[PDB]
């Protein structure tokens, strides 16, 4: 990202978050 | 949670006739989604797939500038033989519900936290009066003032609420590039809620409406033409475009199918007939054995 | 496996035809951490007088039933010491374990979708006026779906499987269990004015039987257990 | 600390509004006074440093303290119970309910003052300086004062006594979103002569 | 010292004219130990919704007042979450902190004996029939001594100082504090049918004043805090 | 002085019945504010609070651009059959008292030291003459000249005081972004005083006014249309916005409650009735036992 | 503690009912440092002929009194060698210790707010004309508040507690002491035309008594001590 | 902060001053 201002929320997009955990929704079962 | 930049590769598989191993069978009642692999349902080849996933990230899916408001007012002399009030301003209560594309994208998630970027795009025109030469479009100075809830509002173009000593206000011209600023994440809670199953008040009466979220008392944008009235008319239209940044989304949703009828609730009247009727969301086909687009040779 | 026992406080539910335990979004109710807390006053954590199975009234499954919903905590706000900790406290936080019961013979057929919807705002058909307090807050009695096909909303039942869900297919299952964590944008909430989970029981495939097994009286029973419940803002009862 | 206009009544003028008037009761368990905790609206806490400064902001969080100083005679004794009731229902009128909430019993003596902390009891991290008093995001609750035993003064001392209430923020207090104060207004550029 | 502050849960009582804190028999309420427990079911220990000061109605101290008694837990069996844990539970155990308030001018004179009597069985005068349920169970209202000189019993007020006691002598004191442990032959008890502490407020020396200070309205206020309260046998409310 | 970025955390506390320890009691007569802790007045839990304090810093509370002046003049030919003087200029004596929001914020402190940032926002319009086509808004060049006290002033548009050889002057156009510059801290003293309990002169007469601070003889801003008169009229309105920087504030104040009636003093007439009447600042309620917003169910 | 003695030069004030010493903004008057000085001519520092308690005239506290203010250095500009160093010198700098005295019986009730306001510019009601020299400069006589509720200004008495303040509550206190440092934007000032501290004595709760103690003559006395006084610009007396 | 000019007073805001001493106003008493 890039920022020209003090405030962190003024910064550009944060598009580097490639994590995935579909198991939250596809296998939400206690016992495998 | 594994990192997924590129979609899954496909592994080579051979014939299989093993007992006790039934991958294509499964139990939907568990609430779990089928874990069957292409590799164990068919014979597959080795495929090294390099297709990216960046463009389904919620930051990109939601992080696009979208129209949330479009207000117009007549820029003229509103003073009459009785009242002196000038009214070349509009007040907009902020919300993401007046326009359906942005609304539905972000009702795909129950909770969202995002710092939002607002771009204001003003456009003028000359009103077609009984007799008026089109003498051009003036470069007026506009003032967009954020009025947080509880602060006194301007009820006139000449009001002195427009000092904006504390209230953030942005002055911009017609000819200049559109105004822009970043509003932070402002909910008194940890996220905005697109849906609120409750009532925003401690009282039971009918005046306390269902679905109104107290934490979404999001304040107001007051916009004014700083220039005083010209001898002639102009219709100023302001389009406000809003761009979520640093989005963080929770609890995906069943997508909206019915049209929105208002911004105060999620009520629906529906289509007269399919598609998107209350009794029929998908359009019809003659029979379950019918191909509407069967390939005929 | 299929045989399951749930022991919470006094209560103990056994089922010999279970699918599994659905943990909504993979979570398991926890008490509020110190670094997430807001209210400074010390909370009360009863741990056995609230965290137990409360079995609500049973619903009759007709061949034409649209579906039922129970809103939480609303459904339990008058039941037991749970309700009396809600009444005497401004603030509330808990998770829920919802167990739905429906038995039928091996000659019966049917399918229930048991959905736990977060922040299920009920949209209403043919009117611009928002749902009234009475039509939303029904308590232990629960509510009935006018439009299960749209989830009493402009959404769809087909896409309802995003939400924590289980089925009761009478071939395979007679009970469904969903564990619901605290699902809110705030560490607490006023339990009398806001519901955070809506437990919906919707027949997708009607209850039916063959010659002689038609029109069998098949009830549907809901048992809900508060989980890791804590209350704050002790005052008079409301 | 800064005084609250607890006696914000029509019949009170000026400094009479900064002092609540306390008398020996012929009854028992009687309510003496209340305080609307509505900073945003026209209430006792408005004309305070907490009120004035916070009203330049839209959101707030943190505990408050109310300090009540007894301005009677050295011979005037008494016990009061000051209760803070979190929101959700009516403001208490019976001491048998108010005591169920956060309260401090105040015995008069060589220490002239009592502090009750209004604890931060909110579901949200912040509350609102909203125009709607009865919104879940805005309301803080109620502060009530009841007689615990009575006010007792000997014949040579006055039967009528004054309590002065002052409010302040504690170190967990936060103010977030800035705004133009509604307290001060203007209709024209202030001239050089009135 | 004389200045004292009691902070229990929400509550906080200050007094600038105190004698001391009387700890009955030198004890300090504790929770039931594992080696003394009988009931196997897990207890609920609210710890802030019960363990707090409950201020009861005030009594007017006349120049001819015989005295008042409040029975515990009876006095609190309907007040707050304490009463609603008693109602919903068969079994009860707690200690009590009793704080009595009485102010008067330095020109007033009087003396109250504040006695906490264990198992104060009320004997009645001129009849062989035992005290009725109504005449014994008065709750938050409390009772009045017909015979303070005999403690509404065949005993004497002179020898009442065996029991945990404090005085309110208006010269010296305006408040008395007694800490009452669990006082029973059993680790628990049914709170609705048995009272283990009787808090008695008895004027030994009448309230009086000089010219102009006569007939002053002097109330007597009781504040009682349950201490280390725990309940067992969770069932429906009774 | 400790550093406070985040507000205080809350510590866990237990029951307490100790003698000689009375934290909720205190002595207001000492002039000290109650030091009672939430932890020792009630039973508390451990709360790790991460709420920031940056937005109550005086640099942020005061460091916002606020309107301090708004002057307008007619841009035309002011020459008559008698006088040739052109008068398409205004002179403003600098002060923070003509507009109440900025005034009251900074009367919250007795003394302030701040380098100040001035932004000048000009706006034109066409005057509605008996017969005038709206032929657009010219891009006029304006000249804002700071005239320090004792320097000779321009009494005309064509005056030669406008050289600004020594005086700082800024030339800007209508269409260009608003003019901006930073004025330093200029008091002959170590801070500006918003209140002065004294007289600015050595003489006793009535002409020496109370409350006038000699160190606040702050000079003047003279603004001119450099362009000479057009054939037709225009009303030029100049709004001056002022932004304290590097603020340092002393001795907080009792906030103003009465309206301001002028800039030469702090006199007041007050409201007719509450709120903000001389006898009643807060609005009324029927009794001290009355809840105006009682919650009714 | 409560007993206090203030010994300055010749003077010595004792009080056995004091609250504390209020040091305005935590400061303690000091002489002007070399690095803060402006005037190059050598200052005179008498140190005992000025730095001493000057007791001003007493004011009668009525049951309807609005309040009094004394402006400094104006109040002392004619009293002692302090006034004669002011008259003979252009420039002035000092701090002040203000001690306010008010006694009453234990049967009397009342409360005085003793405020030291910096740069208390007196705004006047119902007129656009600024306060005249006479209405502001009253000297040892002091002035009377027309509007204590607004501090003879558009401000409020409620928020007057920002300023260095003490109370005289006759229950607790009969004297209040405030230490005032040099409070100005300049290292000196012309004492005859500018006042930097306004000492205001305002009754918040009226003086009252019971039968026989009504209408008691209760004076209010102000004693002010210059502190670390220094003068500059020696010339003829003005 | 940031500055593109020689003069120090032309610089941007200085908003990094998080010091607090309320004791100046809340406990201005000689003896604790």
Q: How far apart are the first and last CA of chain D?
A: 34
On whether any CB of chain C is under 8 Å from the CB of B259, the answer is yes
C-alpha span between F114 and F191 (Å, rounded): 8
Nearest residue on chain E to C45, alpha-carbon basis? E46
C-alpha span between C223 and C140 (Å, rounded): 11
- Cα-Cα-Cα-Cα torsion G17, G21, G24, G25, nearest 10 degrees, comes to -120
How near does any CA of chain F get to the CA of D150, in Å? 18
The reply to whether residue C43 touches residue E41, judged by beta carbons under 8 angstroms, is no
The reply to whether residue D123 touches residue C236, judged by beta carbons under 8 angstroms, is no
DSSP type of residue B251: E
Dump the DSSP string for B167-203: S-EEEEESSSPPEEEEE----SSSSEES---BBSBS-
C-alpha span between B164 and B81 (Å, rounded): 31
Which residues in C lie closer than 8 A to residue D61 (C-beta atoms)? Answer: 38
Among the listed residues C96, C82, C99, the one whose alpha carbon sits nearest the alpha carbon of residue C46: C82
On whether any CB of chain G is under 8 Å from the CB of H30, the answer is yes
C-alpha span between F4 and F7 (Å, rounded): 7
Which residues in F lie closer than 8 A to residue E27 (C-beta atoms)? Answer: none
Phi, psi of B293 (to 5 degrees): -120, 45
Counting every residue written for chain B, the total comes to 297
CB atoms within 10 A of CB B287: 6
Residue appearing with tokens 């009342």: G110
DSSP type of residue G40: -
Counting every residue written for chain A, the total comes to 32
Phi, psi of G205 (to 5 degrees): -120, 125
User: Kindly report the CA angle at D22 between D17 and D28, in degrees rounded to 5?
Assistant: 140
On whether any CB of chain E is under 8 Å from the CB of D108, the answer is yes
Q: CB neighbours of D112 closer than 8 A, spacing ≥ 6?
A: D69, D70, D71, F27, F28, F29, G169, G171, G172
The reply to whether residue B257 touches residue C150, judged by beta carbons under 8 angstroms, is yes
DSSP H or E run through F70: strand F66-75
How near does any CA of chain G get to the CA of F199, in Å? 5
A–G contact: 3+ Cβ pairs < 8 A: no
On whether any CB of chain E is under 8 Å from the CB of C88, the answer is yes
CB-nearest partner of C42 from F43, F48, F297: F43
C-alpha span between G235 and G212 (Å, rounded): 57
Q: CB neighbours of C200 closer than 8 A, spacing ≥ 6?
A: C67, C68, C69, C113, C114, C115, C116, C117, C120, C145, C151, C160
DSSP H or E run through F185: none
Q: Residue F141 in contact with residue F212, Cβ under 8 Å?
A: no
* Structure tokens belonging to residue E217: 């309205």
CB atoms within 10 A of CB B295: 5
How near does any CA of chain B get to the CA of A13, in Å? 5
Counting every residue written for chain C, the total comes to 238
Q: Residue E10 in contact with residue F45, Cβ under 8 Å?
A: no
* Structure tokens belonging to residue D95: 């001491």
- Cα-Cα-Cα-Cα torsion F213, F215, F216, F218, nearest 10 degrees, comes to 150
Helix, strand, coil percentages, rounded to 5, for chain A: 20, 10, 70
Tell me which method was used to determine the 3D structure: cryo-EM
Chain centre distance of CA F59: 14
- Which CATH number belongs to the domain containing residue C125 in this structure? 2.60.120.20
Q: Which domain holds residue A10?
A: 1-32
Nearest residue on chain G to H29, alpha-carbon basis? G22
Strand order, beta sheet including D77-85:
D31-36, D142-152, D77-85, D102-107, E11-15, E4-8
The reply to whether residue B214 touches residue D87, judged by beta carbons under 8 angstroms, is no
Residue appearing with tokens 């009128």: D93
C-alpha span between B258 and F231 (Å, rounded): 61
Sign of CA dihedral G95, G101, G106, G107: negative
Report the phi/psi class of residue F188: left, alpha or beta, with left for phi > 0 and alpha for psi in -120 to 50. Answer: alpha
Sign of CA dihedral G79, G82, G86, G89: positive
Q: Residue C102 in contact with residue C218, Cβ under 8 Å?
A: yes
CB-nearest partner of A26 from B5, B33, B115: B33
Q: Residue B202 in contact with residue D139, Cβ under 8 Å?
A: yes
Write the secondary structure of chain E as one string of H (helix), E (strand) and C (coil).
CCCEEEEECCEEEEECCEEEEEEHHHCCCCCCCHHHCCCCCCCECCCCCCCCCEECCCEECCCCCCCEEEEECHHHCCCHHHHHHHHCEEEEEEEEEEEEECCCCCCCEEEEEEEEEECCCCCCCCCCCCCCHHHHCCHHHCEECCCHHHCCCCCCCHHHHHCCEEEEECCCCCEEEEEECCCCCCCCECCCCCCCEEEEEEEEEEEECCCCCCCCCCEEEEEEEEEEEEEEEECCCC
CB-nearest partner of E21 from F17, F21, F25: F17
Q: Which domain holds residue E115?
A: 4-234
On whether any CB of chain G is under 8 Å from the CB of H32, the answer is no
Q: Count the domains in chain H.
A: 1
Q: Residue B192 in contact with residue B112, Cβ under 8 Å?
A: yes
Sign of CA dihedral F222, F225, F229, F231: negative
* Structure tokens belonging to residue F27: 């002595």
Q: Which of the other chains make 3 or more beta carbon contacts under 8 angstroms with chain A? A: B, C
* Structure tokens belonging to residue G135: 């209405």
Among the listed residues E135, E137, E72, E112, the one whose alpha carbon sits nearest the alpha carbon of residue E219: E112
Q: Count the domains in chain E.
A: 1
Q: Which domain holds residue D79?
A: 1-194
Q: Where are the alpha helices (DSSP H) in D21-98?
A: 49-54, 95-98
Q: CB neighbours of F72 closer than 8 A, spacing ≥ 6?
A: F90, F235, F236, F237, F238
CA of C116: how far to CAs of B40, C132, C177, F132, in Å?
32, 22, 10, 69
Phi, psi of B145 (to 5 degrees): -115, 120
How near does any CA of chain H get to the CA of F3, in Å? 4
Which residues in C lie closer than 8 A to residue E86 (C-beta atoms)? Answer: none
C-alpha span between B41 and B145 (Å, rounded): 61
b/e burial code for range C165-188 (CB count within 10 A of at least 16 → b): bbbbbbebbbbbbbbbbbbbbbbb
DSSP-derived pairing of the beta strands C175-180 and C18-23: parallel
Q: Count the domains in chain D.
A: 1
Q: Residue B240 in contact with residue B96, Cβ under 8 Å?
A: no
At residue G134, the 3 state secondary structure works out as helix
């Amino acid at each position: 990202q890039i920022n020209f201002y003090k405030d962190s929320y003024a910064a550009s997009a944060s598009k580097q978050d490639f994590s995935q955990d579909p198991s939250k929704f596809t296998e939400p079962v206690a016992e495998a | 949670g594994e990192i997924v930049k590129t979609v899954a590769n496909t592994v080579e598989s051979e014939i299989k006739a093993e007992l006790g191993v039934i991958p294509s069978l499964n139990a939907v009642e568990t609430g779990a989604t089928s874990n069957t692999e292409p590799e164990e349902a068919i014979q597959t080849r080795t495929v090294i797939n390099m297709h990216g996933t960046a463009e389904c990230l919620v930051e990109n899916f939601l992080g696009r500038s979208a129209l949330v408001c479009m207000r117009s007012f007549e820029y003229k002399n509103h003073s009459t033989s009785t009242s002196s009030i000038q009214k070349n301003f509009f007040i907009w209560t902020l919300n993401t519900r007046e326009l359906v594309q942005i609304r539905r994208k972000m009702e795909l998630f129950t909770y969202l936290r995002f710092d939002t970027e607002i771009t204001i795009v003003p456009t003028l025109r000359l009103f077609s009066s009984s007799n008026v030469s089109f003498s051009g479009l003036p470069n007026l100075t506009l003032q967009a003032m954020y009025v947080p809830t509880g602060a006194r509002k301007p009820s006139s173009q000449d009001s002195f609420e427009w000092q904006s000593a504390c209230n953030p206000s942005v002055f911009f011209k017609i000819n200049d590039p559109p105004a822009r600023l970043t509003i932070p994440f402002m909910s008194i809670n940890s996220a905005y809620a697109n849906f609120y199953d409750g009532f925003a008040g401690f009282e039971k009466k009918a005046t306390v409406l269902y679905g109104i979220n107290p934490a979404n008392t999001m304040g107001n944008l007051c916009l004014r033409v700083v220039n005083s009235y010209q001898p002639v008319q102009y219709t100023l239209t302001v389009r406000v475009y809003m761009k979520p940044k640093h989005i963080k989304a929770w609890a995906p949703r069943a997508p909206r199918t019915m049209p929105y009828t208002n911004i105060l609730n999620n009520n629906y009247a529906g289509r007269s007939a399919a598609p998107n009727a209350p009794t029929a969301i998908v359009s019809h086909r003659s029979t379950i054995k019918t191909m509407p687009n069967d390939i005929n040779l | 496996d299929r045989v399951l026992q749930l022991k919470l406080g006094n209560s103990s539910i056994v089922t010999q035809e279970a699918a599994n335990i659905c943990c909504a979004y993979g979570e398991w109710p926890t008490y509020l951490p110190d670094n997430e807390a807001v209210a400074i006053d010390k909370p009360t954590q009863p741990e056995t007088s609230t965290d137990r199975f409360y079995t609500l009234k049973s619903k009759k499954w007709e061949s034409n039933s649209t579906g039922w919903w129970w809103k939480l905590p609303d459904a339990l706000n008058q039941i037991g010491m749970f309700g009396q900790n809600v009444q005497y406290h401004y603030l509330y936080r808990s998770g829920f374990l919802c167990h739905v019961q429906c038995n039928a013979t091996k000659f019966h057929q049917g399918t229930l979708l048991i959905v736990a919807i977060p922040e299920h705002q009920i949209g209403k058909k043919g009117t611009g006026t928002s749902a009234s307090f009475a039509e939303v807050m029904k308590g232990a009695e629960g509510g009935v779906f006018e439009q299960p096909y749209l989830l009493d909303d402009g959404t769809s039942l087909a896409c309802a499987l995003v939400y924590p869900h289980q089925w009761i297919n009478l071939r395979t299952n007679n009970s469904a269990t969903i564990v619901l964590p605290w699902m809110n944008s705030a560490p607490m909430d006023f339990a009398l004015r806001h519901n955070n989970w809506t437990l919906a029981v919707i027949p997708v495939c009607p209850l039916a039987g063959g010659t002689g097994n038609t029109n069998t009286y098949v009830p549907i029973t809901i048992s809900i257990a508060p989980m890791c419940a804590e209350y704050n803002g002790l005052r008079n009862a409301i | 600390e800064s005084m609250m206009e607890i006696n914000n009544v029509n019949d009170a003028s000026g400094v009479e509004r900064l002092r609540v008037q306390i008398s020996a009761q012929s009854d028992m368990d009687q309510l003496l006074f209340n305080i609307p905790l509505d900073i945003q609206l026209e209430g006792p806490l408005r004309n305070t440093l907490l009120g004035n400064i916070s009203r330049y902001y839209t959101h707030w969080s943190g505990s408050l303290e109310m300090t009540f100083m007894f301005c009677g005679s050295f011979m005037t004794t008494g016990k009061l119970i000051i209760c803070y009731t979190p929101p959700g229902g009516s403001s208490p009128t019976d001491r048998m309910q108010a005591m169920l909430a956060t309260h401090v019993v105040w015995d008069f003596g060589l220490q002239s003052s009592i502090t009750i902390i209004i604890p931060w009891i909110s579901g949200s991290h912040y509350r609102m300086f909203n125009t709607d008093a009865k919104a879940i995001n805005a309301n803080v609750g109620y502060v009530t004062c009841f007689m615990q035993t009575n006010l007792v003064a000997p014949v040579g001392a006055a039967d009528q006594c004054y309590i002065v209430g002052m409010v302040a923020a504690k170190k967990d207090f936060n103010l977030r979103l800035m705004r133009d104060s509604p307290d001060i207004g203007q209709s024209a550029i202030l001239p050089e002569q009135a």
